[PDB]
């Protein structure tokens, strides 16, 4: 322990130790989402954003990794299924149509989930970046703990242990910044909770009662990063130094409109490539975007801006790629 940014707790709750943060939010009702991307008749969306059928549906076998490499599947938004070092773990699972506490108001995904809970292979762990309704889905937790359970190791930030138990999960681990743990079975892999510049909120006045963050999974064979939700911040340089080089990093590239406002909690594609450089990863996956309209940008804009920023930094789509809904990708290491 020499020079890591730690928490990061004001009076009772946690602010971001990062300097760029400014405290002023006015939340989500009808206001900035509105319709400035204008998703048209679904056939348009099928052409632009085709939802694929994941490999583990047609071929339920083959869903391991056979050590060596690293397989990844994008299940919309921040839902990512990662297979490595004899483990298959999900990240920020959202399978409901609506990311909201109500059934009558809230952002409803314009792209259906590539698969269902019953159809996915045996999960060994779930990673929760923060507690927002588009990353933490009550019904999804219910489904996973109904099919899985005790066998499902939930890795959550500080403050969500109570919530997880109230949902009905027994194998739950609260982690603080730079804290680590593992799956009981496979001790060779370590799951570390690492900083991020975001916030937490589900109800009134519980703002930041629970922590946010990012996850670093250190296997013997593969190293993986998952940013979650964040604006640009110096803690990703710290992550790239302490850990790294990583094999895959999942970086949000969406919901970066009113930068003047979002920039403190949401990178844009330029800042996303900035993250990719910071974390010292070999490859990066474009998560967020494409699933929910959580900001004002055109729903196809973030990939275009990502390619522009990639060219800016002298990189190619190979280094930082965007998948289709349900598409998979295998990556074998040196």
Ligand X SMILES: O=S(=O)(O)c1cc(S(=O)(=O)O)c2cc(S(=O)(=O)O)ccc2c1
Ligand Y SMILES: CCCCCCCCCCCCCCCCCC(=O)OC[C@H](COP(=O)(O)OCCN)OC(=O)CCCCCCCCCCCCCCCCC
Ligand Z SMILES: C[C@H](CCC(=O)O)[C@H]1CC[C@H]2[C@@H]3CC[C@@H]4C[C@H](O)CC[C@]4(C)[C@H]3C[C@H](O)[C@]12C
Rounded Cα–Cα distance for residues 124 and 140 (Å) = 15
Cα–Cα separations (whole angstroms), residue 11 to 8, 130, 139, 160, 209? 10, 20, 33, 19, 11
Query: Do 211 and 158 contact (CB within 8 A), yes or no?
Result: yes
Residues 132-191 that bind a copy of itself (CB under 8 A): 138-139, 147
Q: Are strands 172-175 and 190-194 parallel, antiparallel or unpaired?
A: unpaired
> Which of 83, 124, 137, 229 lies at the binding interface for Zn ion (CB under 5 A)?
229
Which CB sits closer to ligand X, 108 or 241?
A: 108
Output the smallest distance, CB 235 to ligand X, in A. 32
Rounded Cα–Cα distance for residues 220 and 85 (Å) = 7
Output the smallest distance, CB 25 to a copy of itself, in A. 23
> Which of 52, 143, 167, 173 lies at the binding interface for ligand X (CB under 6 A)?
143
Q: Is 106 in the site for ligand Y (CB under 6 A)?
A: yes
Q: Is 138 in the site for ligand Z (CB under 6 A)?
A: yes
Residues 106-135 that bind ligand X (CB under 6 A): 112, 116-118
Q: Is 61 in the site for a copy of itself (CB under 8 A)?
A: no
DSSP state of 202: S
What token pair was written down for 95?
Answer: 């399978």
Which CB sits closer to ligand Z, 137 or 278?
A: 137
Output the smallest distance, CB 103 to ligand X, in A. 7
Q: Which residues contact 253 (CB under 8 A, 6 or more apart)?
A: 267, 268, 269, 272, 286, 287, 288, 289, 302, 303, 305, 306, 322
Rounded Cα–Cα distance for residues 157 and 192 (Å) = 10
Q: Is 102 in the site for a copy of itself (CB under 8 A)?
A: yes
Q: Which residues are annotated as a binding site?
A: 130, 132-135, 198, 201, 205, 229, 266, 288, 293
Cα–Cα separations (whole angstroms), residue 27 to 10, 16, 163, 202, 240? 22, 18, 22, 11, 32
Output the smallest distance, CB 60 to a copy of itself, in A. 12
Q: Is 255 in the site for ligand Y (CB under 6 A)?
A: yes
> By the criterion CB under 6 A, which residues form the site for ligand Z?
26-27, 29-30, 101-102, 104-105, 138, 163, 166-167, 202-206
Binding site for ligand X (CB under 6 A): 95-98, 112, 116-118, 139-140, 143
């Amino acid at each position: 322990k020499s020079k890591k940014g730690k928490d990061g707790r004001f009076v009772n709750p946690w602010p971001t130790w990062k300097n760029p943060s400014i405290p002023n939010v006015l939340r989500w009702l009808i206001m900035e989402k509105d319709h400035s991307s204008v998703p048209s008749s679904k056939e348009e969306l099928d052409k632009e954003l085709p939802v694929l059928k994941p490999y583990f549906i047609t071929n339920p076998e083959e869903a391991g990794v056979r050590e060596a490499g690293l397989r990844v599947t994008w299940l919309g938004h921040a839902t990512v299924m990662v297979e490595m070092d004899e483990l298959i773990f999900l990240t920020d699972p959202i399978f409901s149509s609506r990311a909201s506490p109500s059934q009558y108001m809230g952002p409803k995904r314009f792209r259906r989930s590539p698969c269902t809970i019953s159809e996915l292979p045996p999960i060994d762990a779930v990673l929760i970046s923060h507690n927002h309704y588009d990353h933490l889905d009550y019904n999804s937790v219910i489904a996973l703990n109904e099919r899985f359970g005790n066998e499902l190791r939930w890795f959550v930030p500080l403050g969500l242990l109570d919530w997880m138990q109230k949902c009905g999960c027994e194998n739950v681990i609260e982690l603080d910044w730079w804290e680590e743990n593992c799956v009981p079975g496979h001790d060779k892999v370590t799951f570390v909770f690492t900083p991020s510049q975001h916030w937490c909120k589900r109800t009134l006045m519980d703002d930041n009662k629970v922590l946010w963050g990012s996850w670093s999974v250190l296997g013997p064979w593969n190293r993986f990063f998952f940013a979650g939700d964040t604006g640009y911040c110096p803690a990703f340089e710290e992550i790239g130094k302490r850990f790294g080089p990583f094999d895959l990093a999942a970086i949000p590239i969406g919901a970066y409109e009113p930068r003047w406002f979002m920039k403190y909690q949401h990178v844009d594609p330029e800042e996303a490539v900035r993250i990719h450089t910071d974390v010292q990863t070999k490859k990066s996956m474009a998560i967020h975007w494409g699933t929910f309209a959580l900001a004002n940008e055109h729903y196809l804009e973030p990939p275009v801006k990502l390619n522009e920023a990639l060219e800016r930094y002298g990189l190619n789509a190979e280094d930082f790629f965007v998948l289709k809904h349900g598409e998979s990708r295998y990556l074998n290491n040196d």
